[PDB]
Amino acid sequence: KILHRLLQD
Amino acid sequence: HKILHRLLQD
Amino acid sequence: NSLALSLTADQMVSALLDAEPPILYSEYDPTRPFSEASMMGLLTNLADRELVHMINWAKRVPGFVDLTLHDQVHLLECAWLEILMIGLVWRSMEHPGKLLFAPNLLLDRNQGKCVEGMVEIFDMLLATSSRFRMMNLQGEEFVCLKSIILLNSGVYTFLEEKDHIHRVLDKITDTLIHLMAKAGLTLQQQHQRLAQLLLILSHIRHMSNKGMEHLYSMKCKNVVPLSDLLLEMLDAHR
Amino acid sequence: NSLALSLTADQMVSALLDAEPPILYSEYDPTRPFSEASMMGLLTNLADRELVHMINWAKRVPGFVDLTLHDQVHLLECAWLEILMIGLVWRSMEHPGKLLFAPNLLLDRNQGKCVEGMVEIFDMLLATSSRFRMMNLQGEEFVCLKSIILLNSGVYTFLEKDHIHRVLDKITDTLIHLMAKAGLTLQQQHQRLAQLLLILSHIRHMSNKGMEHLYSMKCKNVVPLSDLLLEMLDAHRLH
Ligand SMILES: CC/C=C\c1cc2c(cc1O)CC[C@@H]1[C@@H]2CC[C@]2(C)[C@@H](O)CC[C@@H]12
Ligand SMILES: CC/C=C\c1cc2c(cc1O)CC[C@@H]1[C@@H]2CC[C@]2(C)[C@@H](O)CC[C@@H]12
């Protein structure tokens, strides 16, 4: 999940 | 000639 | 001109409560278990019957008969499934976990899996129903919300009678807050509660958009025959 | 606890004003004719880049970072197109008849006819822009509505987060505070609050139509969508 990753970056 | 149309007239 | 712009807050409520449609019955036969086509036939048979009562209810919504017949048609085409759903949700408020389609058709979350694609919509309806119950939605507020959906849902997809519609929408806002002042709410709680009720209409609109797509899938796959009124009602959304 | 619940109205506005994402440019090349595919490509290219700024902005929305990651995902997955759309309409307010997707991408409705099924959504977007213009929507009210959309659109599909409702209630307080300060009477205040909140229902409508249209472009292979966009589309279910 890209979103999940972008949200913790 | 919609049914809705008629029902609203009625 | 009009007379709807000069009703008092108490007479607005009174008019709206008096305009309420009756609660209709299913012709469900509780001896015959369900299929995807039987329940669905049952649901759209009731919907069709509810629709003819809704049209006579709208005509009783103060300010409505002031609109052009063309404008009344467009507003009901836009709003019908929303109005059906807010009704269902309100009926089902005190039956946690169940949708009360009719006094004799009370369906469990799990029975929605009888129809394909139906359960995700059931869930949204049930969650809305839970929201209502949590807020302790009152009957007087309900009738306001329902009128607001009628007038609001198609207003922007139209002689600036948008302005007349907006004027009466303003009267129903006043009515809503009058009911809240009357219930002893502080100013801050009135304005917070009004916002809560109105943000749910966003979710009701979401559910109608999804329901229309489902209804359309069942139309194409000819799983159930839909009445002429339903067909035309469904055709307006594409 | 939450540093959102004790913010004042003025600190709420200020926080949300500074969180605003920048205006991005289109990679529009005005030396080739628009096709259905080329315009959809321009549109989804820009959307994908705005998405990244939106994710950054959401975390600056008071209360949003209190939530779990799974809740944050659900919320953005639910509201993203609505948020793109409300920003566009706001950008387009003082361009009557036009949609300012980017400063180098200002489109009228006839240019929307390039993509099939598009012009209908363009018309709804333009009528919303017009509505914002007749209401004289202010920047401060806009940042509050945009945040309400983020918190509210996915909240009922949490299948009770009263923390979400706490914050939504504080934004309600904030909007009324801005209306009080703007000199609106008490009844004008609640009247306007309703008018603004009722428009969020039309934005939901536009978002659902646009999601069905985007799915349709994907299913007909008119345009390659980024994996992020593909994922955002997937969170919704269509046919
Ligand atoms: C049996 C209840 C009576 C009216 C009624 C019916 C409905 C609803 C409310 C009613 O009062 C709301 C849900 C409706 C459903 C009709 C069939 C739909 C549109 C499905 O294709 C998708 C969503 C279904
Ligand atoms: C292009 C400007 C940047 C972002 C942006 C994009 C859009 C919009 C707003 C943006 O800021 C609003 C409409 C969106 C459109 C993206 C493509 C969609 C989803 C079509 O398939 C149907 C509706 C289109």
Expressed as residue numbers, the domain containing D41 is 1-239
Four-CA torsion D115, D119, D120, D123, nearest 10 degrees: 150
Using alpha carbons, list the distances in angstroms from residue D197 to B7, C86, D24, D64: 32, 18, 27, 20
Q: Which two tokens stand for residue A7?
A: 């949200």
> Which amino acid is present at C130?
S
Distance (Å) from the alpha carbon of D88 to chain C's nearest alpha carbon = 17
Say if residue D132 is exposed, middle or buried (CB neighbours under 10 Å; 0-12, 13-18, 19+): buried
**Cα D102 to Cα D88: distance, rounded to the nearest angstrom:** 9
**Is C169 within 8 Å of D194 (Cβ atoms)?**
yes
**Is C151 within 8 Å of D201 (Cβ atoms)?**
no
Domain count of the fold of chain C: 1
Q: Which two tokens stand for residue C160?
A: 């600036």
- Structure obtained using: X-ray
| Helix (H) / strand (E) containing C102 | strand C98-102
**Cα D47 to Cα D24: distance, rounded to the nearest angstrom:** 10
- Expressed in angstroms and rounded, the spacing between residue C81 Cα and the centre of ligand 1 is 8
Q: How many CA atoms lie within 13 A of D30 on its CB side?
A: 5
Inspect the interface and report whether the beta carbons of A3 and D227 lie closer than 8 Å. Answer: no
Neighbours of C (≥3 Cβ pairs closer than 8 A)? B, D
CATH number at residue C39: 1.10.565.10
Ligand-binding annotation for D50, yes or no, is yes
Angle at D236 between CA D235 and CA D238, to 5 degrees: 135
DSSP string for residues in D64-133: GGGS-HHHHHHHHHHHHHHHHHHHHHHHTTTSTTEEEEETTEEEEHHHHTTSTTHHHHHHHHHHHHHHHH
**Cα C99 to Cα C119: distance, rounded to the nearest angstrom:** 12
**Atom 13 (ligand 1) nearest CA:** C85
**Cα C3 to Cα D176: distance, rounded to the nearest angstrom:** 30
Distance (Å) from the alpha carbon of D156 to chain C's nearest alpha carbon = 6
Q: Which residues contact C47 (CB under 8 A, 6 or more apart)?
A: C84, C230
Using alpha carbons, list the distances in angstroms from residue C238 to C216, C225, C231, D53, D225: 10, 19, 11, 34, 25
Q: Which chain C residue is nearest to residue D190, measuring alpha carbons?
A: C191
**B6 and chain C: CB distance < 8 Å anywhere?**
no
> Which amino acid is present at D45?
N
Bridge partners for D106 per DSSP: D100
Chains D and A touch (3+ CB pairs under 8 A): yes
Q: Is C105 helix (H, G, I), strand (E, B) or coil?
A: strand
Please report the resolution in angstroms: 2.3
Residues of D in contact with A5 (CB under 8 A): none
Segments in chain D forming alpha helices (H): 9-18, 36-58, 69-91, 109-112, 118-135, 139-152, 162-181, 186-219, 227-235
Q: Which two tokens stand for residue D124?
A: 């709804």
Residue of C39, C42, C43 to mutate, ligand 1, most atoms within 8 A of C-beta: C43
**Cα C137 to Cα C92: distance, rounded to the nearest angstrom:** 12
Among C212, C237, C234, residue whose Cα is nearest residue C85: C212
For chain B, how are helix, strand and coil distributed in percent, rounded to 5? 70, 0, 30
Distance (Å) from the alpha carbon of A8 to chain D's nearest alpha carbon = 8
